Design an enzyme around this catalytic site. Structure first.
Site, mmCIF file in Angstrom:
data_model
loop_
_atom_site.group_PDB
_atom_site.id
_atom_site.type_symbol
_atom_site.label_atom_id
_atom_site.label_comp_id
_atom_site.label_asym_id
_atom_site.label_seq_id
_atom_site.Cartn_x
_atom_site.Cartn_y
_atom_site.Cartn_z
ATOM 1 N N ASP A 31 0.829 -1.199 0.000
ATOM 2 C CA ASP A 31 0.000 0.000 0.000
ATOM 3 C C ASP A 31 0.864 1.250 0.000
ATOM 4 O O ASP A 31 1.639 1.482 0.935
ATOM 5 C CB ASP A 31 -0.936 0.022 1.198
ATOM 6 C CG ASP A 31 -1.524 1.393 1.429
ATOM 7 O OD1 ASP A 31 -0.877 2.209 2.123
ATOM 8 O OD2 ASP A 31 -2.611 1.667 0.879
ATOM 9 N N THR A 63 -5.788 3.915 -2.510
ATOM 10 C CA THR A 63 -4.864 4.997 -2.203
ATOM 11 C C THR A 63 -3.723 4.972 -3.192
ATOM 12 O O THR A 63 -3.318 6.004 -3.741
ATOM 13 C CB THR A 63 -4.309 4.823 -0.792
ATOM 14 O OG1 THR A 63 -3.929 3.452 -0.607
ATOM 15 C CG2 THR A 63 -5.330 5.204 0.241
ATOM 16 N N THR A 64 -3.179 3.775 -3.399
ATOM 17 C CA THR A 64 -2.342 3.483 -4.543
ATOM 18 C C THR A 64 -2.867 4.198 -5.778
ATOM 19 O O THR A 64 -2.259 5.154 -6.273
ATOM 20 C CB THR A 64 -2.332 1.965 -4.742
ATOM 21 O OG1 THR A 64 -3.588 1.431 -4.307
ATOM 22 C CG2 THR A 64 -1.238 1.318 -3.923
ATOM 23 N N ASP A 108 -6.232 -3.122 6.333
ATOM 24 C CA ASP A 108 -7.099 -2.614 5.280
ATOM 25 C C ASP A 108 -8.334 -3.483 5.138
ATOM 26 O O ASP A 108 -9.459 -2.978 5.073
ATOM 27 C CB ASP A 108 -6.335 -2.547 3.960
ATOM 28 C CG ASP A 108 -5.511 -1.284 3.825
ATOM 29 O OD1 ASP A 108 -5.900 -0.255 4.416
ATOM 30 O OD2 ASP A 108 -4.481 -1.317 3.119
#
Lengths: 309, 522, 532, 39, 521
Positions: free
Chosen positions: B60, B93-94, B390
């Protein structure tokens, strides 16, 4: 060559300026920089700006004063106008932008007349009296002296302009919520002091999902359970939540054995009795910033009371 | 010797305008390339080591970006958003960073045109808002429908979510774990309750979820080995108060002339500890826990009476414990009663990786579990935990929100198409922005195909053609390497993720484009 | 694994060169089109240089990264091939590189990109010939007037162009020259240009002949000759040498006086022999002795020493003189002939900016043209001549190729769309490169508009539309048009406006641009090596 | 445009190895470990 | 690392303002220095000497800078100085101020090119303006020229000595007219030699009907006083000079060596008798002189000078009309040093000087400057340089301009007349340049030190009436004055290049957008 003379070695190393040259030139230019520094600043079309402080802290900004606050300027007269709007901001808010613009422009033509040979003193008076005349003529231009005290719609339409100037993108939301804020607050401590407003910053959940509460928040932890009662009975204690230790160094003393048992034992029961008497008042929450007694919270859970820290 | 007066400090750097503006955009692009490969069913992860020498791998980006300490200002904003979206929804988010710089990227040539950023951001607000609502419109719920068990969708989401990070081959394994685990989180719903135990060694496929708590921790006292370590149906005591002969209690001098009174006193101090212990024993319970240190001797007394005890415990796991067994942590031994006294289906304590752990589960009403995470690499643990983390928070919102969408880039392609046609409606300078907004938009699968090393152009033209009329959730397959109903291929996402993603990206550039110069202070 | 320097490959270098090129572009992006703004560079010590032409700018710009040097040298070549487009051509180079890179920046196979680019250039120039406009039907002087003032735009002198272009066109028709027996080639750089701070370019004058950055050797010598008696002589005039090693040995002192006597008499008799022809003007790049100076004053003659070799070559071609490396004859005696003389109406040295420079008026043998520059500072003159230098070439090319192209960026306006449709023809993946090729080709008007500082896209969009319209309803004789303006910020007919450029300019421009990106694009890895 | 700009501290000495080159570099190291222990 | 490795670059408005500022400085540092009420400046050369001078050029010619446009401004000063001499008292001060307002439209986001475009329009009318308001003058009349000259020189410290220089400047100027160009004769100010000698007084300095030499008779027996001598300019040396062909001798017999030595004696004497055959009186040469021949030339009682500078030899030749010779055997009597009214060599005080007076109608002359100290003298001649220079310009054009700012306002309203009639965006630049013009009389006010604003408004108000154009500003009273009585009169061409130069400056700096350093070649 290599050896001019000095008629006054009065200075051990310093800057003395004279001949009006700085006034006629250097004073003006520094002011002109400030205009150039923030000329873009104001405007619904005026765009924001960011600067890093000397301590490497980020500041995206459209308000002049705040960014102005981020500038260690070293020209003296620079600071004057800086602190000027600084207090001006302290007085009214936005306008910092505007006054600086006023500042440079007033300066900008001023040397021109000064360079044209107009008297500095006479420049002062004419600049003075005109401003006075401006005050005289200003009031006759008021239109739509909006009056409705506690409507949402009027001020929402009103306050937008301040918002739009320093945020052209999201006026509708921002208008309503502060209008939500303003109408929520009445004349209580005296006519809606600004400080009566608190702001909480929470990352994520973009601006549209930002909200406004008819209450108040704390981004802090909890000790027992988490409940709401529509009839909230709150206890408030600037005192730290523990047995009142004498400020004087009062060391408990014993002489015989049975002291020890009753000593620890009694402390327990009294705090319980302390918190019990609180609980009998039905106060389902106690609040303090101060130091918290551990058995008390042990008791507090035992009577299931909320704590604030 | 007079000198012309400087305005600001020596070396107070500034650079203004498009050359200033464009530079940041490049930095953004630089940032993205550090993460472009990352997310994806065949995606990527990176390793970074600090100046202290501690290596750190991550998949991540937000963690990686947090590792990547940016010196540039505008780039930190991108780093800032990651924490936001990570604190919001997790992986992607990547992609979120990909969202921004690509949005940055396409306008950058239009930035070369002297276009007022306000114009650009104006559509950006318009585009995102218009985009956002369409997300809501074509969002998918199931509770109106009939063929959903309340967890299958959650099960599908995590498999989808899990199908990018380091445990990708065991998603079918852990998915059940977390879903049934998260089934316990009601209704505090917070991650703090549930612990993670980064137990070293062992195959991660042997990593455990206990319907209770275990302790990775202990400490050696004298009899701590001696006492029985099985208690089939025990009663659990939770003491915060320490147990020792006035080790750290109130400080007081005592005065005694008579030796016998001196005699009596030291005896009395012991009787204090005995008296608690008598209260401890006469409780009839068998296990005592303390955040605080415990006198070694009492252990022997507990050993003598075959009760278990443990001190110096993490309160957090103790907090789990009380939340696990329902019993109440105590500071008063005397006011004790069985109501606050924990009970568990069975308690044990087991060697795992050589490590000395304490075992107790089977509580029918325990809204808190813990994850025993076997794994032979230190780096795996936190990486898995981050993956584990996550997985939890994302399904948590899914529990909160019964709205799902297909994955595999289909959503974005659907959006880009919708906006693409919409751009035809709006004349003029906005229209160009809309297309590029779409033109930046489609990137996500392209990198996925890039990360798949495929010819995304064929895929894209196929997709765009295939996404012209025939079906919404058609999207990229990694394995068949082309279009598929990833929805029917069960690639399912909570809307909010991309919902927040694009919005956060939207302001990012809107933030980004809105600056004309920089100022530096040493 | 090589010492004294590492390597970087793939995207890292790929983008790096792109970053290099874009850097190069922005350096010159502001000096192009009728609203471009010229550059200046402090050298290191204040010998600064203001100039708008990148080929100067680049040549005066030190470069260390490879790919940029390609552009600079490429910029030099087109200057050696056109002279301007320096305003543009490099801008073309990087931008096409910019877009082409972007495709590959995703995945795109470079060689595929090259191939479409190969076609794109060939496609472009073919249509270029399919959109050509000829100047033969048009008024020769008028269009040369037009293109020059078009070329005079973007330059310091663009305001006065009408005077200037008129001055210029006269010069070239005065530099008519008969070529291989079948061409009227017109030699550039043959025109003499002398720069002189002082009066305005209002007072700058063309010479119907040649002007010399030289002075009279002898103050007593006369100053102005109304006659045509003119000679050049490479042969220097000093006391003649032994010139290899030839020792003079005396055992009989009695003739040394006679020896020393003749030492100069040879030069003297050569003076006498040439003078007896009656020649009144002479040049000699070699040194001139005072003995000769004295003799010529006795003649009241006119002489020059140390004249630059090329100009006297122009002089001999101008005056009809024969430059003479020496005196000779098909028979052994060194003889001299009046037939070697050059001829012209009048020759004067004149002090312009208090410095006497020599003027030549109307050589009857071959009409000559030279131009005298007047300006404020030396900084102004040496740049304006470069524009003048480029000014000649473009007209020379128009003379060289009796054909014209309308100026003001119409080219890509037409090209972009025509290729845009043409891209669809291939059906491959290269048409994307074709599309970007066109897309990147759109840069110029954008640069123009930003250089004019208005809303570019809308101008472009309108330009797109009419040109797109120019590709609708093939009855285009009243639907095909050409033109765009910036001063008023709206499109026009450059054909009506007279805004024209030489075809060859853009032709080589694209091709040289085409080659350049091809060279740059195929790169995938650079390796550094530190010096010894 | 082209000019140096600062992103990550010690950027000069912030070296970075990527992709196939990085991977093999691990392998050679790994083999070194493998052979180091072989006997 | 990409571009040029530590060579700085800048662009746009900051560049624009920076050039705007520096010129503002550049003009400002001299604004004290124009006008009959000007100031006078003394300078440190880097190597120790002192120059004290009001003429701005040398001041700026003596200025070291780092910013380019200043150096760009520098040359502009020296160029007009070179072409015109003065106005350098004013041109740059015009120039920067033009720029000073020229910036004022930069914030108006107006592209400079149009602003340039108006400028070229503006100057055109300006030149046309002055031609309309010029006045031709007779050139034969001395006194007006003398008036013109004092009008031209009542700005420098020699003001107290106007009578001397005016005639001094006129006389040399008149006596330099080289008519072999038909009626296109041209004067030269390099044959206008200037000799500065300290001591004495300004009143002692005078125009000499001939040339002055800082050398002495080679031998005492040659007379130091002659009425009507004959003068020889031998470009060649007077002695035996190398056989140029690395010549060599191989004697074998005794008498040979002694024989050859006589031969050089013989060779030298040979030269002597060739000289005397023309019955000369004075010998001048840029090279050395054999004393042995000098014995012969002493034996002929013929005056001799050795190793004289060539330019002086020319002026000496131009003094007595004779032509220089390098060939005694080919010497020609047409170059007999006839045209010599008096020959003498005085003693200045520690220096012999050569006195060559009363040529019939000499074309060359040197001015003898006899003062207090050479820096005083050097200052004087610079003013002399300007004084004579303008006169030839007057000899180049008989059309005159009334200065004192009178002409300046004349165009100023004239452009204002043009301005209002020339509607468009370019109008505002047009009036602005007119606005620029007004400063020069204004500047004159400060150098006087009067109520500039009031006087200027009145002057403009005064010049609103078409009936009067010679109304200008008196130097000392600081009052409005018609020029006709005031008499400060100027060559029109002086003002032409002034504006010509001024505007050229403007455009050149305006197109700038960028700075590049570190060329390294």
């Amino acid at each position: 060559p290599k050896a001019p003379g000095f008629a006054q070695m009065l200075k051990e190393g310093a800057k003395h300026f004279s001949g009006l040259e700085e006034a006629v030139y250097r004073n003006i230019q520094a002011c002109k920089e400030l205009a150039q520094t923030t000329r873009t600043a104001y405007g619904p079309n005026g765009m924001n700006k960011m600067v890093i402080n000397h301590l490497e802290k980020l500041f995206v900004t459209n308000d002049a004063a705040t960014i102005l606050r981020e500038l260690e300027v070293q020209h003296p007269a620079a600071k004057m106008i800086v602190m000027a709007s600084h207090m001006q901001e302290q007085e009214v808010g936005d306008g910092t932008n505007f006054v600086l613009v006023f500042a440079g422009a007033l300066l900008e033509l001023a040397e021109e007349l000064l360079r044209i040979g107009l008297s500095v003193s006479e420049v002062i008076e004419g600049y003075e009296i005109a401003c006075r005349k401006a005050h005289e003529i200003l009031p006759n231009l008021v239109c739509c002296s909006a009056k409705n005290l506690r409507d949402i719609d009027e001020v929402s339409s009103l306050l937008r302009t301040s918002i739009m100037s320093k945020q052209y993108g999201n006026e509708v939301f921002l208008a309503k919520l502060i209008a939500q804020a303003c109408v929520s607050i009445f004349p209580d401590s005296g006519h809606f002091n600004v400080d009566n407003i608190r702001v909480c910053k929470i990352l994520g959940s973009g601006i549209s999902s930002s909200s406004v509460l008819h209450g108040m928040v704390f981004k802090k932890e909890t000790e027992g359970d988490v409940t709401s009662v529509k009839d909230a009975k709150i206890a408030v204690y600037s005192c730290p939540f523990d047995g009142m230790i004498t400020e004087t160094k009062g060391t408990v003393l014993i002489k015989t054995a049975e002291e020890l048992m009753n000593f620890s034992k009694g402390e327990e029961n009294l705090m319980d009795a302390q918190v019990k008497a609180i609980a009998d008042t039905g106060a389902n929450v106690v609040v303090t910033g101060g130091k918290v007694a551990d058995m008390a919270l042990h008791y507090a859970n035992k009577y299931n009371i909320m704590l604030v820290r | 010797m007079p000198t012309p007066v400087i305005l600001l400090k020596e070396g107070t750097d500034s650079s203004q305008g498009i050359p200033q503006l464009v530079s940041n955009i490049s930095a953004c692009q630089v940032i993205a390339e550090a993460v472009r490969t990352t997310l994806g069913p065949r995606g990527m992860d990176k390793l970074i080591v600090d100046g202290r020498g501690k290596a750190t791998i991550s998949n991540d980006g937000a963690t990686i970006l947090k590792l990547l300490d940016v010196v540039h200002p505008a780039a930190k904003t991108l780093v800032d958003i990651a924490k936001s979206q990570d604190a919001e929804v997790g992986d992607g988010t990547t992609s979120v960073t990909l969202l921004a710089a690509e949005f940055l990227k396409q306008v950058k040539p239009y930035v070369e045109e002297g276009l007022h950023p306000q114009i650009i951001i104006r559509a950006f607000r318009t585009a995102t808002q218009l985009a956002v609502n369409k997300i809501k419109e074509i969002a998918v719920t199931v509770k109106k429908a009939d063929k959903v068990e309340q967890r299958k969708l959650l099960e599908k989401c995590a498999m989808t979510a899990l199908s990018s990070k380091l445990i990708s081959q065991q998603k079918a394994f852990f998915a059940k774990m977390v879903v049934d685990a998260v089934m316990m989180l009601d209704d505090l719903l917070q991650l703090k309750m549930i612990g993670i135990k980064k137990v070293q060694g062992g195959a991660l496929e042997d990593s455990q979820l206990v319907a209770g708590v275990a302790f990775k921790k202990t400490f050696s006292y004298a009899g701590f080995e001696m006492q029985p370590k099985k208690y089939h149906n025990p009663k659990i005591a939770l003491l915060n108060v320490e147990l020792e002969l006035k080790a750290e209690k109130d400080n007081a001098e005592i005065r005694v002339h008579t030796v016998e009174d001196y005699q009596a006193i030291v005896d009395a101090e012991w009787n204090i500890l005995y008296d608690k212990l008598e209260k401890i024993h006469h409780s009839g319970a068998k296990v005592v826990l303390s955040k605080l240190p415990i006198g070694d001797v009492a252990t022997q007394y507990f050993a003598d009476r075959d009760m278990f005890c443990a001190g110096r415990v993490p309160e957090e796991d103790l907090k789990r414990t009380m939340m696990a067994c329902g019993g109440s942590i105590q500071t008063s031994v005397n006011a004790l009663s069985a109501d606050v006294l924990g009970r568990c289906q069975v308690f044990e304590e087991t060697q795992i990786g050589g490590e000395r752990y304490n075992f107790f589960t089977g509580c029918p009403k325990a809204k808190t579990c813990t994850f025993i995470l076997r794994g032979g690499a230190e780096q795996f643990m936190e990486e898995t935990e981050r993956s584990l983390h996550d997985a939890i928070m994302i399904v948590r919102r899914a529990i909160k929100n019964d709205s799902v969408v297909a994955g595999g880039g289909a959503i974005e392609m659907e959006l880009s198409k919708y906006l693409r046609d919409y751009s035809r409606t709006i004349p003029g300078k906005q229209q160009l922005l809309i297309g590029a907004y779409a033109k930046a938009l489609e990137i996500i699968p392209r990198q996925l195909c890039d990360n798949a090393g495929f010819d995304a152009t064929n895929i894209l033209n196929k997709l765009r053609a295939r996404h012209a009329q025939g079906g919404t959730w058609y999207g990229v397959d990694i394995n068949n390497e082309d279009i598929a109903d990833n929805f029917e291929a069960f690639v399912w996402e909570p809307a909010m993720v991309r919902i927040n993603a694009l919005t956060a990206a939207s302001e990012a550039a809107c933030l980004i484009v809105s600056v004309d110069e920089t100022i530096k202070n040493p | 694994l090589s010492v004294f320097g590492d390597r970087s490959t793939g995207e890292t270098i790929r983008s790096q060169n792109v970053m290099a090129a874009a850097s190069i572009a922005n350096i010159v992006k502001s000096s192009l089109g009728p609203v471009g703004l010229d550059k200046m560079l402090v050298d290191d010590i204040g010998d600064v240089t203001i100039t708008n032409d990148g080929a100067t700018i680049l040549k005066l710009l030190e470069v260390e990264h490879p790919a940029a040097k390609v552009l600079c040298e490429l910029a030099d070549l087109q200057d050696k091939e056109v002279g301007d487009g320096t305003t543009s051509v490099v801008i073309i180079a990087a931008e096409l590189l910019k877009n082409a890179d972007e495709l590959v920046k995703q995945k795109i196979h470079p060689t595929s990109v090259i191939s479409g680019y190969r076609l794109a250039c060939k496609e472009a120039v073919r249509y270029i010939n399919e959109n050509l406009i000829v100047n033969t039907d048009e008024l020769g002087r008028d269009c040369l007037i037009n293109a020059a003032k078009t070329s005079m735009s973007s330059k310091i002198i663009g305001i006065n162009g009408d005077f200037f272009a008129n001055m210029v066109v006269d010069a070239v028709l005065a530099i008519k020259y008969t070529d291989i027996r079948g061409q009227p080639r017109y030699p550039v750089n043959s025109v003499n240009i002398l720069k002189a701070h002082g009066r305005s370019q209002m007072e700058s004058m063309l010479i119907s002949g040649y002007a010399l950055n030289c002075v009279v050797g002898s103050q007593g010598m006369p100053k102005r000759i109304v006659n045509a008696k003119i000679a050049c002589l490479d042969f220097s005039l000093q006391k003649t040498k032994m010139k290899l090693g030839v020792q003079v040995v005396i055992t009989d002192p009695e003739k040394l006086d006679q020896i020393r006597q003749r030492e100069s008499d040879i030069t003297k008799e050569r003076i006498q022999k040439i003078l007896a022809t009656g020649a009144n003007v002479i040049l000699t790049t070699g040194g001139i002795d005072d003995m000769c100076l004295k003799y010529f004053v006795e003649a009241g003659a006119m002489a020059v020493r140390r004249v630059l070799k090329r100009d006297l070559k122009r002089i001999a071609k101008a005056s009809g003189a024969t430059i003479l490396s020496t005196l000779a004859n098909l028979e052994g005696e060194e003889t001299f002939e009046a037939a070697m003389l050059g001829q012209a109406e009048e020759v004067v040295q004149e002090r312009i900016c208090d410095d006497e420079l020599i003027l030549i008026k109307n050589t009857k043998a071959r009409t000559s043209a030279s131009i005298i520059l007047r300006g404020a500072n030396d900084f102004m003159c040496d740049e304006m001549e470069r524009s003048l230098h480029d000014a000649l070439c473009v007209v020379k090319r128009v003379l060289e190729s009796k054909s014209v192209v309308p100026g003001g960026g119409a080219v890509e306006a037409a090209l972009s769309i025509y290729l845009e449709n043409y891209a669809t023809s291939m059906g491959s993946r290269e048409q994307l490169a074709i599309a970007e090729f066109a897309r990147s080709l759109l840069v110029i008007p954008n640069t123009l508009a930003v250089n004019a500082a208005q809303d570019s896209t809308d101008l472009v969009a309108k330009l797109r539309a009419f040109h797109n319209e120019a590709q609708v309803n093939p009855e285009r004789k009243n639907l095909k048009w050409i033109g765009l303006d910036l001063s008023n910020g709206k499109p026009r007919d450059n054909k009506q406006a007279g805004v024209f450029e030489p075809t060859i300019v853009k032709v080589k421009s694209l091709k040289f641009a085409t080659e350049a990106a091809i060279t740059i694009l195929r790169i995938d890895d650079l390796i550094k090596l530190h010096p010894e | 445009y082209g000019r140096p700009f600062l992103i990550i501290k010690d950027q000069d000495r912030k070296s970075r190895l990527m992709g196939l080159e990085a991977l093999k570099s691990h392998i050679m190291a790994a083999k070194a470990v493998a052979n180091t222990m072989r006997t | 690392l990409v571009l040029s490795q530590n060579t700085k670059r800048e662009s746009g408005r900051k560049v624009q303002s920076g050039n705007i500022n520096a010129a503002k400085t550049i003009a400002d540092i001299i604004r004290t220095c124009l006008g009959p009420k000007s100031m006078m400046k003394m300078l440190l050369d880097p190597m120790g000497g002192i120059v004290m001078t009001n003429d701005g050029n040398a001041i700026l010619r003596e200025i070291q800078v780092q910013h380019p446009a200043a150096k760009s401004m520098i040359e502009i000063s020296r160029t007009q100085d070179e072409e015109v001499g003065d106005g350098t008292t004013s041109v740059i001060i015009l120039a920067g101020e033009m720029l000073s307002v020229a910036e004022h439209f930069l914030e108006q986001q107006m592209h400079p090119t149009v602003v340039i475009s108006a400028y070229r329009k503006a100057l055109d009318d300006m030149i046309s303006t002055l031609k309309k308001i010029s006045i031709p003058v007779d050139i034969s009349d001395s006194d007006m020229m003398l008036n013109i000259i004092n009008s031209s020189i009542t700005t420098k410290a020699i003001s107290r000595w106007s009578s001397l220089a005016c005639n001094i400047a006129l006389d040399a100027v008149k006596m330099v007219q080289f008519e072999e160009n038909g009626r296109k004769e041209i004067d030269i100010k390099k044959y206008a030699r200037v000799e500065k000698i300290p001591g004495g007084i300004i009143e002692d300095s005078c125009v000499l009907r001939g040339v002055m030499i800082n050398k002495d008779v080679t031998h005492p027996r040659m007379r130091r006083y002659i009425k009507n001598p004959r003068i020889v300019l031998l470009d060649s040396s007077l002695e035996y000079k190398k056989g140029e062909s690395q010549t060599d001798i191989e004697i074998t017999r005794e008498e040979d060596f002694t024989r050859i030595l006589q031969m050089e004696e013989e060779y030298i004497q040979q030269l002597c008798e060739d000289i005397i055959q023309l019955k000369p009186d004075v010998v001048i040469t840029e090279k050395g002189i054999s004393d042995l021949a000098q014995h012969y030339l002493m034996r002929a009682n013929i005056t001799a000078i050795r190793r004289v500078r060539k330019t002086d030899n020319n002026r000496i030749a131009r003094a007595c009309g004779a032509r220089i010779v390098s060939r005694p055997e080919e010497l020609r009597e047409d170059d007999v040093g006839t045209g010599a009214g008096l020959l003498e060599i005085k003693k200045i005080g520690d220096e012999y000087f050569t006195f060559i007076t009363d040529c019939k109608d000499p074309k060359a002359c040197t001015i003898l400057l006899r003062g207090a100290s050479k820096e005083i003298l050097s200052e004087v001649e610079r003013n002399l340089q300007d004084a004579m220079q303008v006169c030839r310009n007057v000899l180049l054009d008989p059309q005159l301009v009334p200065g004192g700012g009178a002409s300046e306002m004349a165009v100023a309203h004239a452009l204002t007349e043009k301005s209002k009639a020339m509607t468009g965006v370019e109008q505002w630049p047009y009036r602005a340049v007119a606005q620029a013009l007004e400063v020069i009389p204004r500047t004159l006010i400060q150098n006087c030190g009067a109520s500039t604003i009031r006087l200027l408004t009145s002057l403009r108000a005064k010049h609103t009436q078409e009936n009067c154009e010679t109304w200008g500003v008196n130097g000392e009273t600081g009052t409005l004055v018609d020029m006709k009585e005031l008499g400060i009169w100027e060559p029109l061409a002086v003002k032409l290049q002034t504006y010509k130069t001024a505007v050229e400056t403007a455009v050149l700096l305006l197109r700038i957008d960028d700075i590049v350093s570190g060329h390294k070649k």
